């Protein structure tokens, strides 16, 4: 599923926030699938994300 575009975004998201894909996706959706906000998204909450979602990032 998902559109190769949104997917690629997940990659950048999992390669920029690296907060675990599954979760990163949670961000790809909780971020309106923007990007800039996505990134910031991770860097946003950064106070509730677990160790499972945040993998060394």
């Amino acid at each position: 599923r998902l559109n190769p575009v949104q997917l690629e975004l997940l990659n950048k998201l999992h390669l920029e926030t690296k907060l675990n894909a599954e979760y990163t996706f949670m961000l790809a959706e909780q971020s309106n699938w923007n990007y800039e906000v996505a990134i910031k998204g991770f860097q946003s909450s950064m106070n509730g994300i677990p160790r499972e979602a945040f993998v060394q990032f």
Partner: peptide, 9 residues
């Protein structure tokens, strides 16, 4: 799990 949020929604 889920229900988590990022960018100030």
């Amino acid at each position: 799990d889920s229900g988590f949020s990022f960018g100030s929604k």
